[PDB]
Amino acid sequence: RPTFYRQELNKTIWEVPERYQNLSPVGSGSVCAAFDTKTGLRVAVKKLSRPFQSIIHAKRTYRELRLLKHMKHENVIGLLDVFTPARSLEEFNDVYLVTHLMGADLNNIVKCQKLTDDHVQFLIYQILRGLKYIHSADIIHRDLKPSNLAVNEDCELKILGFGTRWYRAPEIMLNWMHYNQTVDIWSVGCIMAELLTGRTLFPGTDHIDQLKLILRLVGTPGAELLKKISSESARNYIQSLTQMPKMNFANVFIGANPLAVDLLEKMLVLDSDKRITAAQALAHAYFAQYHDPDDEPVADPYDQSFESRDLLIDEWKSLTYDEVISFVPPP
Numbered sequence: 120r121p122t123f124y125r126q127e128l129n130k131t132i133w134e135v136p137e138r139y140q141n142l143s144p145v146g147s148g149s150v151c152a153a154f155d156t157k158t159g160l161r162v163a164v165k166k167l168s169r170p171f172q173s174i175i176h177a178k179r180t181y182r183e184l185r186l187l188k189h190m191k192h193e194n195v196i197g198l199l200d201v202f203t204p205a206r207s208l209e210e211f212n213d214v215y216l217v218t219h220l221m222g223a224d225l226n227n228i229v230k231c232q233k234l235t236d237d238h239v240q241f242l243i244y245q246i247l248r249g250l251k252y253i254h255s256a257d258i259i260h261r262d263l264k265p266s267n268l269a270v271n272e273d274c275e276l277k278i279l280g281f282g283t284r285w286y287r288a289p290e291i292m293l294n295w296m297h298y299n300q301t302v303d304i305w306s307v308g309c310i311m312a313e314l315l316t317g318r319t320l321f322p323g324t325d326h327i328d329q330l331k332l333i334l335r336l337v338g339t340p341g342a343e344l345l346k347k348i349s350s351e352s353a354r355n356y357i358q359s360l361t362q363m364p365k366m367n368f369a370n371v372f373i374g375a376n377p378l379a380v381d382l383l384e385k386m387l388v389l390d391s392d393k394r395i396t397a398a399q400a401l402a403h404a405y406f407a408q409y410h411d412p413d414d415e416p417v418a419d420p421y422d423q424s425f426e427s428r429d430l431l432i433d434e435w436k437s438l439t440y441d442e443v444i445s446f447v448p449p450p
């Protein structure tokens with residue numbers, strides 16, 4: 120067992136092993152930058168807030184640990200280390216998670232810099248590459264947005280912060296369940312649009328405003344799509360908005376690479392069934408400079424059967440603890 124030391128950082132206490140030095144708060148659970156003495160690399164240590172505060176907190180703690188132990192991909196946050204100061208399950212109430220330090224997110228980029236086309240290519244390519252992997256594990260991210268996309272100085276990108284309204288699929292704003300993975304493709308279209316234009320695609324004030332703005336661009340849904348909305352009040356709202364012409368993305372995005380525009384048109388489609396998939400989008404001509412079908416890996420199958428259970432705080436806590444103890448660091 121490592122030697123642990125104690126420290127106070129922004130009123131929040133930290134008890135970490137000696138290998139981690141120079142702890143510096145970055146955000147607020149709460150995250151610190153630190154120096155990993157073993158590897159000589161800078162890392163992010165995340166202290167979970169109140170991991171076993173409730174059944175919802177305890178299940179969420181287990182969910183995030185399980186998820187992160189499985190994610191092994193260049194464009195997805197992965198676990199370098201996980202630890203607790205606790206000796207025995209009896210003491211267990213703190214979980215620390217460790218990953219490679221990243222430095223900025225995509226919102227710090229927007230922002231800030233004006234992005235040329237090759238940069239938008241590389242960035243969106245990396246999102247879709249991580250997204251292909253995530254989706255291949257039967258995981259929907261659900262919360263893809265600039266602040267959930269960590270980027271270093273090399274413009275290397277990793278997806279984190281697994282599930283604003285600005286990036287949210289319209290079917291999410293409408294409730295609906297049986298979301299497909301392409302809710303994430305919608306968010307990618309919004310992110311891509313913003314990187315191209317320097318402007319939020321759909322900066323809605325509320326869920327209702329968000330829908331109007333979406334409809335202004337992509338047009339009223341056709342009859343085939345309207346028939347699928349059971350909700351009479353959603354149907355009434357939609358059909359009241361006189362009738363939106365589908366704008367020409369070509370005009371809306373004038374100045375952009377026409378291949379960027381074509382891909383966007385395939386991402387920002389109302390019908391979730393008719394949205395391009397992550398794997399399809401990677402073979403789009405827009406990414407010709409980057410696409411290598413032998414270097415776009417898929418994930419081992421991922422067991423989220425636990426999502427079905429209603430367990431006691433103590434049960435979730437014991438399962439989480441088992442995952443801490445069985446952790447095996449990467450090469």
Ligand SMILES: C[S@](=O)c1ccc(-c2nc(-c3ccc(F)cc3)c(-c3ccncc3)[nH]2)cc1
Pocket residue numbers: 145150163164165196198216217218219220221222266267269279280
């Ligand atoms: C959407 S919310 O603003 C939010 C944003 C980022 C994070 C966030 N969580 C982490 C983080 C750190 C360590 C882990 F093991 C797992 C996640 C980072 C991180 C990772 C690498 N380098 C710098 C920071 N950012 C949590 C919540």
Ligand SMILES: CCCCCCCCO[C@@H]1O[C@H](CO)[C@@H](O)[C@H](O)[C@H]1O
Pocket residue numbers: 289290293295296297298299330333334340344347357389390391392
């Ligand atoms: C702005 C209002 C337009 C409503 C968008 C509805 C289109 C979403 O697409 C719908 O998503 C569901 C998957 O969750 C599927 O069951 C439907 O087959 C699919 O058409």
